[PDB]
Amino acid sequence: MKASRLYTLVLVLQPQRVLLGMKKRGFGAGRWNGFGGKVQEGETIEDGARRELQEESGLTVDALHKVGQIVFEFVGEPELMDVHVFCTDSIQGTPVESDEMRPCWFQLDQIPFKDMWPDDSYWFPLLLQKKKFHGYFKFQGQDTILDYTLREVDTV
Amino acid sequence: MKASRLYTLVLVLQPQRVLLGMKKRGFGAGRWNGFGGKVQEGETIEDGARRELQEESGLTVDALHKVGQIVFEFVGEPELMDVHVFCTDSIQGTPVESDEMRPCWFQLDQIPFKDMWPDDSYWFPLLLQKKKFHGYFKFQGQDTILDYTLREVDTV
Ligand SMILES: Nc1nc2c([nH]c(=O)n2[C@H]2C[C@H](O)[C@@H](COP(=O)(O)O)O2)c(=O)[nH]1
Ligand SMILES: Nc1nc2c([nH]c(=O)n2[C@H]2C[C@H](O)[C@@H](COP(=O)(O)O)O2)c(=O)[nH]1
Ligand SMILES: [Mn+2]
Ligand SMILES: [Mn+2]
Ligand SMILES: [Mn+2]
Ligand SMILES: [Mn+2]
Ligand SMILES: [Mn+2]
Ligand SMILES: [Mn+2]
Predict the structure, then answer these.
(1) 3-state SS of A9-21?
(2) What are the structural domains, with CATH classification, of chain B?
């Protein structure tokens, strides 16, 4: 029994492209990723995801849709990361570079898997198929998966 | 905010009655409650719910569904309890007293609220109406609620 900390992850997925951000600092720096961060006290998970999307990308959205949940365990870290994954296709401003992230659009035949977290290669295809998923990944460091589970679900 | 630990709570709800257990030893001793406990590593939440029901009541479950999620914060404790609440749909066997619980059936107009956790007075009416819910309760000790939120949701 480990304790878990709540995080969000937001993918702006349109019919032919996806918006990712190059992490400029901190956890997972140097990798393309969705936008997100810790959930704060008092806000719902979905509202935390909307807040992190605005802080990191400048984008505001009226609604998000939860598509997945991924639990991350790191060797030597007692706390799990419980990451709630959201999507939207509907935005209405322009992405802005922040201190944390440089946003960039990618065509859906040019997903930069080699420059993303290794677990993304497993669950991102499900997200692109509009399937919902639950995942778990145990990492040694930032590069090496020691154990993982991935399952499609009808409800997250 | 605080990290959380993962728990289940299972209610055997039939059209005419509900099964509760009197806690005999540890946390929440002296109060009627559903059956449940900590979710174990690598175990799905729903599998943890089925396991705890069998251990504490002797009943085996052929079908159950998630009806709610309640987060508990106890003043002075470092972490939250994240409690996933389930109702059974099909059971077999007879309830049996265990070292931790004494099971007893209650008519649905005789819910023993005064001998249950104080938060049950808020969310249990939603469970009885077959409404899905999200709750949060901040406790000072075991008797006093300082703050809470409770909402009906379409999906848990
Ligand atoms: N795609 C992907 N995102 C991750 C992984 N691990 C992980 O913390 N994240 C996300 C969750 C959060 O949005 C973010 C970490 O939060 P910060 O932005 O506060 O560092 O990184 C991962 O393995 N893959
Ligand atoms: N109805 C109700 N159940 C609770 C509350 N707090 C709380 O831990 N529980 C349940 C969750 C767990 O299933 C159980 C405690 O698990 P243990 O058997 O590990 O002590 O008690 C509460 O405030 N109300
Ligand atoms: Mn943040
Ligand atoms: Mn952030
Ligand atoms: Mn971030
Ligand atoms: Mn138990
Ligand atoms: Mn237990
Ligand atoms: Mn128990």
Answers:
(1) EEEEECCCEEEEE
(2) 1-156 (3.90.79.10)
